[PDB]
Amino acid sequence: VVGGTEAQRNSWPSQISLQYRSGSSWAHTCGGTLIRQNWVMTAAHCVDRELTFRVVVGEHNLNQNNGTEQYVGVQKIVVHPYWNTDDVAAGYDIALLRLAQSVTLNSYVQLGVLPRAGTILANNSPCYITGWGLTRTNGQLAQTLQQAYLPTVDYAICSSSSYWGSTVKNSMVCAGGDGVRSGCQGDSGGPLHCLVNGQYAVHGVTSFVSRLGCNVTRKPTVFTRVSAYISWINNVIASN
Numbered sequence: 462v463v464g465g466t467e468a469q470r471n472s473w474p475s476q477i478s479l480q481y482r483s484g485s486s487w488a489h490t491c492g493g494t495l496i497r498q499n500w501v502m503t504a505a506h507c508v509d510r511e512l513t514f515r516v517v518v519g520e521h522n523l524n525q526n527n528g529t530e531q532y533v534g535v536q537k538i539v540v541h542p543y544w545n546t547d548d549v550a551a552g553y554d555i556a557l558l559r560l561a562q563s564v565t566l567n568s569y570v571q572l573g574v575l576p577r578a579g580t581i582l583a584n585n586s587p588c589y590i591t592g593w594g595l596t597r598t599n600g601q602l603a604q605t606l607q608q609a610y611l612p613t614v615d616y617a618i619c620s621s622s623s624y625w626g627s628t629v630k631n632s633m634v635c636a637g638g639d640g641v642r643s644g645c646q647g648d649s650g651g652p653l654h655c656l657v658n659g660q661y662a663v664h665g666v667t668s669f670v671s672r673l674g675c676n677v678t679r680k681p682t683v684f685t686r687v688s689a690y691i692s693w694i695n696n697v698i699a700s701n
């Protein structure tokens with residue numbers, strides 16, 4: 462997250478860190494959202510490589526024991542049927558990960574609330590992005606979870622010429638674009654939390670930023686719109 466502030470430990474308990482095995486250690490590569498005790502939602506492009514993956518829930522400082530983490534393996538990866546690696550602008554950047562065991566819920570580990578199917582937010586709706594991604598374009602990862610206030614940019618504005626044009630589709634949510642705050646590499650797969658009827662719900666899965674940089678004016682961070690995929694999500698959990 463560029464232009465973030467550090468999050469409190471218990472503020473976003475459905476956030477997870479998706480990590481892959483890297484020699485004798487594990488390395489953060491993406492975020493995700495815990496949606497069931499044994500299912501995580503993340504972006505399909507985070508699991509394009511055929512690596513060994515684990516999920517860490519109750520995480521706050523990547524490099525330190527916090528006394529709250531649980532570590533669990535990924536047993537099955539279901540990416541969207543229509544995802545295409547060579548075409549992230551087409552959408553469908555979403556995947557669900559079945560965990561090897563069910564995690565224990567507590568004040569640090571909770572399920573993410575999903576929106577109702579079809580829900581579209583009004584422009585400039587209050588949302589927060591969270592993650593351990595780069596804190597500057599071409600910088601390095603954060604050690605502790607960061608958050609940034611990122612209001613939505615609706616489809617009509619985001620698909621206009623000066624913003625993303627044809628690259629953004631209506632299956633996506635745009636948020637931010639002020640040139641200071643944004644998602645960045647390593648935040649991919651993570652939540653966009655938006656306040657709706659006094660409750661935070663996860664309306665986006667972080668998908669992409671500009672090739673020019675993470676925080677670029679009029680190039681808001683782009684998210685997979687979760688409410689376009691509620692039927693698919695529920696069909697996969699009900700049979701896997």
Ligand SMILES: *[C][C@](*)([N]C(=O)[C]([C])[N]C(=O)OC([C])([C])[C])N(*)(*)(*)(*)[C@](*)(*)=O
Pocket residue numbers: 489490491492507594595599600601602645646647648649650
């Ligand atoms: C999948 C991708 N993640 C990264 O690019 C990672 C987290 N960045 C990284 O490993 O650190 C340096 C900057 C290469 C040292 N994008 C979305 O999360």
Ligand SMILES: [Ca+2]
Pocket residue numbers: 520521522523524525526527530
């Ligand atoms: Ca830790």
